[PDB]
């Protein structure tokens, strides 16, 4: 096999089994595998997903080279991951020049400029979220964050991308909202993906049969919805769809299905991500009352008598930013960053052969006792103006880095912050019947709690 590769390069790592590579070692999940390999093998190690070699790197200089310096030349693409269909055109899945084009075509849709006019729309569902909370606060019902935050994230997506304005929490049976509750992110350690990892030679077989990891039911509904959405009815708005089709006017030439694929990927991208992070944040706040109180104190100072948050007031809130950042340190939901090596290359004193997947293990790096004092504790002061400088931007990578980092980063931060401001203005959050303390991470392929976070909401 290719199983002698790392032994031949003098690169250490877990010894692999025939066919399986090292995938049995994922029985405790990616992040714990990554943590242990790091503690056992040091700064660089290798393992095999089936026959695919994967080189883990932890040196910031080396991480910078891969993510920033040699992105266009060598490390342009992610690992191809399964039968994908037309979604091959989605920006996050596209490769080389097709990616570079789509990235350029879609960049203007993520400038601070037009993010600001997205704010009132998002904001509108800040208030929606509140009443839904108030209804469950007044009746002292312990609250499923994942649900209420899930619905909020949906609402913000529907409206910001297509103009569909639905309180999804109380409209769960609406054609749009229902399996546009969707695309949930892929458990790459579930049996289907474990199998394609061992038999990647079966992927073209699935492709030919038009089998797709993206449910074609959901994909159908949307492609048509978008289509319909282009009568064109306008025959203003400031959503993603129109920011996307108004770019089809005036290199370039964004196809109309390609466009659909991006619409799909933006949901898949920002639905479960936003709501998962928002839940992890509320969990930390409830289990750290002083931090929650400080945050509410900051919010009431910037926005007196419960003032409506604005673009500029959001950015003004420093403790908020620290609380969001520190939650992302503990729970970097992407878990690893990856690029495929396109050419034989020697970087920072190490030769890396063509075809290796270079992997940066963000979860393991975010909790490395070398860059982080008492790494398991939730300590927002890590990110204060004072201590912020001692943080390496290639150790701390919740949104990746370089030309291929999270394109939706500014929007996600703004989104979450708006929601957290509006929520914290009206409620205090407290541990409860359920509350798994400490929180227990799932052993699956997703960075999420084992049991869903539930908390009491009390009206201020
Ligand atoms: C808390 C929320 C989010 C987190 C933590 C997050 C994190 C990440 C990370 C770590 C990457 C990989 C970057 C890399 O490989 O260097 C990524 C990629 C990406 N994200 Fe996000 N993301 C979030 C929300 C969103 C949202 C709201 C959108 C879109 C509206 C989005 C769209 C994308 C896209 C399109 C990519 C692939 C970019 C490319 O390949 O060109 N993400 N994200
Ligand atoms: C998942 C797609 C859309 C392919 O984007 C990425 O490659 N991002 C990181 C993949 C890690 C999978 C686990 C995961 O939870 N995804 C995080 C995510 C998803 C979409 C956008 N932003 C962040």
Curated annotation (Swiss-Prot):
Changing residue 195 to P: In allele CYP3A4*2; exhibits a lower intrinsic clearance toward nifedipine. Changing residue 135 to Q: In allele CYP3A4*15. SUPFAM superfamilies: Cytochrome P450. Induction: By drugs, such as rifampicin. Keywords: Disease variant, Endoplasmic reticulum, Fatty acid metabolism, Heme, Iron, Lipid biosynthesis, Lipid metabolism, Membrane, Metal-binding, Microsome, Monooxygenase, Oxidoreductase, Steroid biosynthesis, Steroid metabolism, Sterol metabolism, Transmembrane, Transmembrane helix, Ubl conjugation. Its cofactor is heme. It catalyses: an organic molecule + reduced [NADPH--hemoprotein reductase] + O2 = an alcohol + oxidized [NADPH--hemoprotein reductase] + H2O + H(+); 17beta-estradiol + reduced [NADPH--hemoprotein reductase] + O2 = 2-hydroxy-17beta-estradiol + oxidized [NADPH--hemoprotein reductase] + H2O + H(+); 17beta-estradiol + reduced [NADPH--hemoprotein reductase] + O2 = 4-hydroxy-17beta-estradiol + oxidized [NADPH--hemoprotein reductase] + H2O + H(+); 17beta-estradiol + reduced [NADPH--hemoprotein reductase] + O2 = 16alpha,17beta-estriol + oxidized [NADPH--hemoprotein reductase] + H2O + H(+). Expressed in prostate and liver. According to some authors, it is not expressed in brain. According to others, weak levels of expression are measured in some brain locations. Also expressed in epithelium of the small intestine and large intestine, bile duct, nasal mucosa, kidney, adrenal cortex, epithelium of the gastric mucosa with intestinal metaplasia, gallbladder, intercalated ducts of the pancreas, chief cells of the parathyroid and the corpus luteum of the ovary (at protein level). Changing residue 257 to P: In allele CYP3A4*18; exhibits higher turnover numbers for testosterone and chlorpyrifos. PANTHER family: CYTOCHROME P450 3A4, CYTOCHROME P450 FAMILY 3. It is linked to Vitamin D-dependent rickets 3: An autosomal dominant disorder of vitamin D metabolism resulting in early-onset rickets, reduced serum levels of the vitamin D metabolites 25-hydroxyvitamin D and 1,25-dihydroxyvitamin D, and deficient responsiveness to parent and activated forms of vitamin D. Chimeric transcripts, characterized by CYP3A43 exon 1 joined at canonical splice sites to distinct sets of CYP3A4 exons, have been detected. All are possibly produced by trans-splicing. The chimeric transcripts exist in 3 different combinations: CYP3A43 exon 1 joined in frame to CYP3A4 exons 2-13, CYP3A43 exon 1 joined in frame to CYP3A4 exons 4-13 and CYP3A43 exon 1 joined in frame to CYP3A4 exon 7-13. The longest chimeric isoform (CYP3A43 exon 1 joined to CYP3A4 exons 2-13) exhibits 6-beta-hydroxylase activity, while a shorter isoform (CYP3A43 exon 1 joined to CYP3A4 exons 4-13) does not. Belongs to the cytochrome P450 family. This is Cytochrome P450 3A4. It comes from Homo sapiens (Human).
């Amino acid at each position: 096999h290719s199983h002698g590769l790392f032994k031949k390069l003098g690169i250490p790592g877990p010894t692999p089994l025939p066919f399986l590579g090292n995938i049995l070692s994922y029985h405790k999940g990616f992040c714990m595998f990554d943590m242990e390999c790091h503690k056992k093998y040091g700064k660089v190690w290798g393992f095999y997903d089936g026959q695919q070699p994967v080189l883990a790197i932890t040196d910031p200089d080396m991480i910078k080279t891969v993510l920033v310096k040699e992105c266009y030349s060598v490390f342009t693409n992610r690992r191809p991951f399964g039968p994908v269909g037309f979604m091959k055109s989605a920006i996050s899945i596209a490769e080389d020049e097709e990616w570079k084009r789509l990235r350029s075509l879609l960049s203007p849709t993520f400038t601070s400029g037009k993010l600001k006019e997205m704010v009132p729309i998002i904001a509108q569902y800040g208030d929606v979220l509140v009443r839904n909370l108030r209804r469950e606060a007044e009746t002292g019902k312990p609250v499923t964050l994942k649900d209420v935050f899930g619905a909020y994230s949906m609402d913000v997506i529907t409206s910001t991308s297509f103009g569909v304005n639905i309180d999804s929490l109380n409209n769960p049976q609406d054609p749009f909202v229902e399996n546009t509750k969707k695309l949930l992110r892929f458990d790459f350690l579930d049996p289907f993906f474990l199998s394609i990892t061992v038999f990647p030679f079966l992927i073209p077989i699935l492709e030919v049969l038009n089998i797709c990891v993206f449910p074609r039911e959901v994909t159908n509904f949307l492609r048509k919805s978008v289509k319909r959405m282009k009568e064109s009815r306008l025959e203003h708005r400031v959503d993603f769809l129109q920011l996307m089709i108004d770019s089809q006017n005036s290199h370039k030439a964004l196809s109309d299905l390609e466009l659909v694929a991006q619409s799909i990927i933006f949901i898949f991208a920002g639905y479960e991500t936003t709501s998962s992070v928002l839940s992890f944040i509320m969990y930390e706040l409830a289990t750290h009352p002083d931090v929650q109180q400080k945050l509410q104190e900051e919010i009431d100072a910037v926005l007196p008598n419960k003032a409506p948050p604005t673009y500029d007031t959001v950015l003004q809130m420093e403790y908020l930013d620290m609380v969001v950042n520190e939650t992302l340190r503990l729970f970097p939901i992407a878990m690893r960053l990856e690029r495929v090596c396109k050419k034989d290359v020697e970087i920072n004193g190490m030769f890396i052969p063509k075809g290796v997947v270079v992997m940066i293990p963000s979860y393991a790096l975010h909790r490395d006792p070398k860059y982080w004092t008492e790494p398991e504790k939730f300590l927002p002061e890590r990110f204060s103006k004072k201590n912020k400088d001692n943080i390496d931007p290639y150790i701390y990578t919740p949104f990746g880095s370089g030309p291929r980092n999270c394109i939706g980063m500014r929007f996600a931060l703004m989104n979450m912050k708006l929601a957290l401001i509006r929520v914290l203005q009206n409620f205090s959050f407290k541990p409860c019947k359920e509350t798994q303390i400490p929180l227990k991470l799932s052993l699956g392929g997703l960075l999420q709690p084992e049991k869903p976070v539930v908390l009491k909401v009390e009206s201020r």
